[PDB]
Amino acid sequence: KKIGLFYGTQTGKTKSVAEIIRDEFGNDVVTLHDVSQAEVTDLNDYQYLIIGCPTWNIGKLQSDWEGLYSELDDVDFNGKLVAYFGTGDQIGYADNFQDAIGILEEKISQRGGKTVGYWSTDGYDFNDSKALRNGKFVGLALDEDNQSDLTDDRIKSWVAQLKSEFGL
Ligand SMILES: Cc1cc2nc3c(=O)[nH]c(=O)nc-3n(C[C@H](O)[C@H](O)[C@H](O)COP(=O)(O)O)c2cc1C
């Protein structure tokens, strides 16, 4: 209802984290949107938005989000509060860890979106990320490949941080 969660997924991993974020907020609060089936004007249907995106070869947006990225100039995000999460592999892609949510955040915040849900880099091992803003991550960084065991507590903490920042 109130929050729209817009995710893109190639191997199902960002999709399953989205479901866990959805159940943590309440199914009554967040509705899931796979960007493969989305129009970019679907983002207009919400004042509170959650962006979910993994980084793929080579340091690119997942392909469904990549498709929409070009059209982001056609939507106005002013007044909207926007959160970001991604899944990533910090061991194999230490130079591009979570680039996708940083790429998306740059554009959306430029087109009006107000970023909520900044996350600590304490607990990760990487060299570089387009997702860094004053030494914080732009949203929750998940690692299902190397750090899957940490993911449930990260979601629980971040959703609680978000419920508070969104005003639920
Ligand atoms: C060929 C390939 C390229 C990848 N490139 C990156 C990348 O540059 N940055 C990153 O953080 N993770 C990278 N990864 C890891 C994926 O982002 C990670 O496994 C993610 O969870 C996949 O999410 P999805 O299942 O929702 O598509 C790559 C994985 C594959 C197999």
Boundaries of every domain in the chain: 1-168
The DSSP secondary-structure symbol of 144 reads T
Task: Name the closest-CA residue to atom 27, ligand 1.
Answer: 10
* Residue to probe by mutation, ligand 1, list 36, 89, 128, 150, most atoms within 8 Å of CB: 89
Which residues partner with 5 through β-bridges? Answer: 32, 50
Cβ-contact 123, 153 below 8 angstroms: no
Give the up-direction half-sphere exposure of residue 134: CA atoms within 13 A in the CB hemisphere: 2
Helix (H) or strand (E) holding 5: strand 3-7
Which residues partner with 30 through β-bridges? Answer: 3
Nearest C-alpha neighbor of 14 from the set 52, 45, 41, 48: 52
φ, ψ (nearest 5 deg) of residue 133 = -140, 110
Cβ-contact 10, 63 below 8 angstroms: yes
Q: Token pair of 146, please?
A: 């190397």
Cα distances (angstroms) measured from residue 153 to each of 63, 117, 148: 28, 15, 10
Solving technique for this entry?
X-ray
The Å distance, Cα 11 to ligand 1 centre, comes to 9
The DSSP secondary-structure symbol of 96 reads S
Helix (H) or strand (E) holding 148: none
Q: Token pair of 22, please?
A: 């959805």
The Å distance, Cα 16 to ligand 1 centre, comes to 14
Superfamily of chain region 1-168: Flavodoxin domain (3.40.50.360)
Atom of ligand 1 nearest to the CA of 16: 26
Cα distances (angstroms) measured from residue 167 to each of 6, 81, 161, 164: 20, 10, 10, 5
Name the 3-class secondary structure at 34: strand
Nearest C-alpha neighbor of 85 from the set 104, 109, 57: 104
Tell me the longest C-alpha to C-alpha distance in the chain: 39
Nearest C-alpha neighbor of 64 from the set 100, 36, 27: 36
Q: Can you give the resolution of this entry in Å?
A: 2.4
The Å distance, Cα 86 to ligand 1 centre, comes to 10
**Pocket of ligand 1, beta carbon within 6 A:** 9-15, 54-57, 59, 62, 87-89, 93, 96-99, 144-145
Q: Token pair of 31, please?
A: 């509705």
Cα distances (angstroms) measured from residue 50 to each of 59, 119, 123, 153: 21, 14, 23, 18
The Å distance, Cα 104 to ligand 1 centre, comes to 16
The Å distance, Cα 158 to ligand 1 centre, comes to 22
Q: CA-to-CA distance for 156 and 126, rounded, in angstroms?
A: 23
Q: CA-to-CA distance for 109 and 37, rounded, in angstroms?
A: 23
Q: CA-to-CA distance for 47 and 77, rounded, in angstroms?
A: 8
